[PDB]
Design goal:
This is part of a larger assembly, with 1 copy of chain A, 1 copy of chain B, 1 copy of chain C, 2 copies of chain D, 1 copy of chain E and 1 copy of chain G. Chain D is mainly α. The longest helix of chain D is centred in the middle third of the chain and has 19 residues. Chain E has one domain. In chain E, a hairpin with a 4-residue loop joins strand 1 and strand 2. The radius of gyration of chain G is 10 Å and the shape is flat. Chain G is mostly loops. Chain G is built from 1 helix and no strands. Classes of the chains: A alpha/beta, B alpha/beta, C mainly alpha, D mainly alpha, E mainly alpha, G little secondary structure. At the A-G interface, strand 3 of A face loops of G. The structure holds S-adenosylmethionine, iron/sulfur cluster and magnesium ion. Chain B binds one RNA strand through helix 3, helix 10, strand 9, strand 11 and strand 12. It is classed as ribosome. Keywords: Ribonucleoprotein complex Mitochondria Biogenesis, ribosome. The entry is titled "Human mitochondrial small subunit assembly intermediate (State E)".
RNA sequence: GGACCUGGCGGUGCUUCAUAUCCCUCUAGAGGAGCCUGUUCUGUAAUCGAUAAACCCCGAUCAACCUCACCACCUCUUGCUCAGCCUAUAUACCGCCAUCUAACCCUGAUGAAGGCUACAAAGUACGUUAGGUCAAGGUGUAGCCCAUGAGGUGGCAAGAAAUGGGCUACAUUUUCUACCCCAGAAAACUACGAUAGCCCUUAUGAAACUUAAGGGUCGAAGGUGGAUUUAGC
């Protein structure tokens, strides 16, 4: 009355912070560019950015975790973790489409390695 | 809407367009960076020689921040309403009410806290009051005050500004403060920061309670950062009514440039405009000389505030290096009737200059806020130049 | 390029193969 | 695993072969588990052979209650 | 479809710088030797001046390739500090780790 | 040809054929996009040059009335155009 | 479906399961 | 009205000390000049922001053109996108930072209530702000839309101070040379000292007094600077 009376689940990658990148986490993309003496780091980085945007737009709501972009010689492996929500026929169609389109866009033999999980692999609750 | 494309024209009286540049157009009211009188700064530093250590910096900063973020004392009716909502949603209500409400305390200004308040607010108050007085001085150069009062005259800042502006005509400086320490501080500052000496300004009268005689009307009555200290709306109402009754020519009211200060000054403005006295000794009506170009309710009270700024050089101290800006709200109420019907919009916000266009927020005489983007092609070369040179707190001379 | 990259998204979304 | 869950003839052959003769108790329990799984494959969608064989298998494995429940389905499907 | 007008202006500059590079080099080579007569060096100063102003290799800026930021650009990645830190903190830049 | 993931491994002959047909249809859609808009895939970055990863051109380039354009249309197996030009 | 690692004998020919470089498959390892 | 229980104390004083920050003391420097670099006003046709206060060697690990988003005119218009706006709005939200404000068991006669001793005696288990920020960390909304959009060519005035930061000195524990620590000269006015001014070469560039390096000329003030301030570990 009178005044004086008054008086979220996270995956393993999400759980760990950027300063654990070489201690507990790894690197999502692997290539030779950033090594001492090597060339074309910027080209690989731009390729990585486009690959991530393209995959996230071509597999909407399927990717359970981040992509892993591996590079061996001339090859380009997109190792992704997806859900078991979309039907397998659509997964095969999208894999074929993505392989062909990325192979012709980067002029290299791209290849996808989908791994399905039932649901987001929760590590803790931040 | 006091700015119509192609219809409104710049207001040319006394041939300011022909006989003067555009930078010297009548509606400019900017004040150069304020520097306090050397006597005042010397007195402040001398009085603060006793203790000006690292503790004083923290204390000054805390006092300034608190006096800024402080809210109005909450009236009982609002508390009852909030309590009702709390019970309907539900000691638990009283705790939830302790939170979501501001704890307002009376500030007991003893000697130490008065020293802190001096060191934290003398310069700012002087700057604000100086700009407020400059408003009257610039718009009516013929007015020569002889009598001044200062409610809550804690440091005499109003007295110093009144001297600085009208020292060749003022002869009486009534100062009122319940705080005896603070009266003593004001006297010491006026005597060069020394307990024994000669006052710099002649004719000062210090007091603790207001004058009593009804027939006495003072030309200028000022209250700067003082009404926000009163504990209740009833106290604020009675104080404002008394000041208006004893106002002869101008009542100047200044507060912190927050929503709190704007609301307080608008309540005072509306009280003074809507006269209740059945047969006052002074029958003269009262109007808003500045900064409002009308008498209707503010278009900015609903959710926003209305403030002004004045930049000034702080008193040299261990923590005061760069020039500062004081943000304050003001209102000047004058007895009688408006001088003419050609009143000009007021800029209540920083003018934004951009290539070939100028954003200006105007409070127009019709009683509305107009957010104008002035450009030469749409509004006129002279008007665009006037807009380009006008800034926060100025008057834009447009007619019809 | 930023034309190849941006207009390829435009074509892909219009064909309904990208979100 | 190869998608033949919903083939009737295969179920029929398996149940008949399983219920043909009397087997040691371990294999009887195993055949009872298989018969229960065939039962569930049916409920997830009734030849008299499959019904009778499932009943006999549950009986031989000692799961008397489920056989007595099967007695209801015999009457239900005529 | 570049990031903004400023990036497009710099893409325009880099195009003409490539087209005019051989001619600029040759005309510039005549003026950087104390052998040929001064009559010829003085004219190549006129020939080089008349070439379109954007063809000059000194008017090209290393803006970021993703945000067109004019400064704070690491040339090895062509990425401004804000965009680099975003990718490096997510472990999307191979080999990059925070120092200890 | 299939993927080792349990959710994507075909379980039946019909399912295996269906998955293969879906994959081939996706490849065909990608090929259609690539050939329909070569301008987005002409930028070559591969050393040595890979001819099999470049867009294919199915349109006549010679437009005049001449025997060489006829031979071009015959090389492209464009029957109706070849008859019309003959 | 169940992983195929359940069907792998303890004396199989491992090189045939991973003939070339491939990413880790939990249902195959 | 008698006896008792929990208290709180939203209260004080004193005593000893552990008493780290903050003090105090102690050590070693800088502070007064000449420059530059931000910023303040002023001045100017002439970037911006930093909106109460506490964070300018700030955005910028770099400004001749460009960068550039500022000014003078000139010049184009469905325009790199099909537009485009460094135009406004976080005084629209969102990110961000900031200001302020249990269960069990025993005892008391089964009362409020209480429960420890180790050479062991009942205890075990937020809200707020006419806040900042669009170098967007975001999403929207308002405007301009033959120009709040493009483009071109030139120009951002500078002397009064007020500050911060840095550099360089005022020398003899110094300066030059050899050398890299056993030498020879110079030395207070032809001593030291200028990253002060002016002139000439070299580098880069299309364009250099206008940016940098060196040489010449020059040899200014400076003569160690209190109150203060910077670190210590
Ligand atoms: C703190 S000063 C405000 C600043 C001052 N006006 C200045 O210019 O520096 C306001 C003073 O008003 C005084 N005051 C409070 N209530 C009052 C009242 N009812 N009548 C007169 N003075 C009052 C307080 O003692 C307080 O010191
Ligand atoms: S917005 Fe206009 S009417 Fe309101 S306080 Fe300000 S000047 Fe006065
Ligand atoms: Mg412009």
């Amino acid at each position: 009355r009178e005044l004086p009376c008054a008086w979220k689940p996270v995956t393993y990658e999400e759980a760990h912070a950027p300063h654990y990148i070489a201690h507990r986490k790894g690197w999502l993309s692997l290539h030779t560019g950033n090594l001492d003496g090597e060339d074309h780091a910027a080209e690989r980085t731009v390729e990585d950015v486009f690959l991530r945007k393209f995959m996230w737009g071509t597999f909407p709501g399927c990717l359970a975790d981040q992509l892993v972009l591996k590079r061996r010689g001339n090859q380009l492996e997109i190792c992704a973790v997806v859900l078991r929500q979309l039907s397998p026929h659509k997964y095969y169609f999208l894999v074929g489409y993505s392989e062909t389109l990325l192979s012709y866009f980067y002029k290299c033999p791209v290849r996808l390695h989908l791994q399905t999980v039932p649901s987001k692999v929760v590590y803790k609750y931040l | 809407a006091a700015l119509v494309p192609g219809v409104t024209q710049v207001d040319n009286k006394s041939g300011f367009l022909q006989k003067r540049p555009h930078r010297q157009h009548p509606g400019i009211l900017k004040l150069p960076h304020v520097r306090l009188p050397q006597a005042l700064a010397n007195g402040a530093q001398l009085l603060l020689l006793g203790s000006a250590g690292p503790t004083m910096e923290n204390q000054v900063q805390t006092l300034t921040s608190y006096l800024w973020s402080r809210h109005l004392p909450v009236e009982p009716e609002e508390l009852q309403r909030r309590a009702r909502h709390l019970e309907k949603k539900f000691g638990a209500v009283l705790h939830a009410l302790r939170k979501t409400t501001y704890h307002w305390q009376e500030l007991s200004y003893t000697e130490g806290l008065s020293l802190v308040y001096m060191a934290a607010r003398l310069d700012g108050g002087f700057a604000a009051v100086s700009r407020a007085f400059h408003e009257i001085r610039a718009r009516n150069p013929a007015f020569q005050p002889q009598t001044l009062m200062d409610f809550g005259s804690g440091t005499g800042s109003v007295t110093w500004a009144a001297h600085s502006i009208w020292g060749q005509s003022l002869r009486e400086y009534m100062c009122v403060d319940r705080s005896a320490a603070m009266l003593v501080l004001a006297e010491k500052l006026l005597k060069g920061g020394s307990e024994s000496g000669e006052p710099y300004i002649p004719g000062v009268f210090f007091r603790q309670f207001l004058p009593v005689s009804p027939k006495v009307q003072f030309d200028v009555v000022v209250s700067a950062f003082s009404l926000s200290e009163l504990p209740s709306k009833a106290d604020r109402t009675e104080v404002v009514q008394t000041l208006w009754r004893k106002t002869g020519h101008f009542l100047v009211l200044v507060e912190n440039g927050t929503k709190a200060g704007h609301s307080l000054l608008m309540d005072a403005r509306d009280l003074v405009l809507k006269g209740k006295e059945k047969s006052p000794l002074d029958p003269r009506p009262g109007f808003v000389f500045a900064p409002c170009p009308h008498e209707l309710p503010c278009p900015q009270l609903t959710n926003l505030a209305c403030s002004f700024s004045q930049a000034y050089h702080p008193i040299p101290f261990s923590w005061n290096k760069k020039p500062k800006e004081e943000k304050f709200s003001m209102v000047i109420l004058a007895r009688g009737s408006p001088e003419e019907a050609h009143r000009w919009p007021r800029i209540t916000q920083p003018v934004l200059k951009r290539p070939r266009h100028v954003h200006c927020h105007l409070c127009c005489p019709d009683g509305h806020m107009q957010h104008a983007v002035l450009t030469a092609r749409r509004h006129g070369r002279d008007l665009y130049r006037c807009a380009r040179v006008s800034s926060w707190g100025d008057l834009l001379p447009v007619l019809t | 390029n930023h034309h190849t990259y941006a207009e390829l998204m435009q074509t892909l979304r219009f064909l309904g193969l990208y979100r | 695993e190869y998608g033949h869950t919903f083939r009737s003839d295969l179920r029929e052959e398996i149940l008949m072969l399983m219920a043909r003769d009397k087997h040691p108790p371990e294999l009887q329990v195993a055949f009872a588990d298989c018969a229960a799984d065939i039962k569930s494959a049916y409920e997830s969608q009734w030849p008299a052979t499959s019904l009778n064989c499932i009943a006999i298998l549950f009986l031989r494995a000692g799961r008397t209650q489920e056989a007595w429940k099967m007695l209801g389905l015999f009457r239900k499907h005529n | 479809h570049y990031v903004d007008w400023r990036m497009w202006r710099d893409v325009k500059r880099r195009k003409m710088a490539y087209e005019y590079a051989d001619e600029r080099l040759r005309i510039n080579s005549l003026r950087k030797n104390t052998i040929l007569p001064k009559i010829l060096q003085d004219v190549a100063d006129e020939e080089i001046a008349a070439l379109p102003r954007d063809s000059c290799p000194v008017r090209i800026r290393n803006r970021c390739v993703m945000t067109s930021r004019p400064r704070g650009v690491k040339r090895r990645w062509r990425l401004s500090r804000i965009v680099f830190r975003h990718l490096a903190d997510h472990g999307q830049l191979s080999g990059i780790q925070r120092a200890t | 040809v299939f993927q080792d993931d349990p959710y994507l491994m075909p379980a039946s002959s019909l399912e295996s054929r269906s998955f293969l047909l879906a994959k081939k249809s996706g490849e065909n859609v990608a090929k259609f996009i690539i050939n329909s808009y070569p301008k987005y895939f002409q930028k070559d970055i591969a050393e040595p040059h890979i001819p099999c990863l470049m867009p294919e051109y199915f349109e006549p380039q010679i437009k005049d009335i001449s025997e060489a354009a006829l031979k071009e249309r015959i090389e492209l197996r464009k029957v109706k155009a070849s008859v019309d030009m003959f | 479906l169940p992983p195929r690692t359940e069907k792998m004998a303890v004396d199989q020919d491992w090189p045939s399961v991973y003939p070339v470089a491939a990413p880790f498959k939990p249902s195959a390892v």
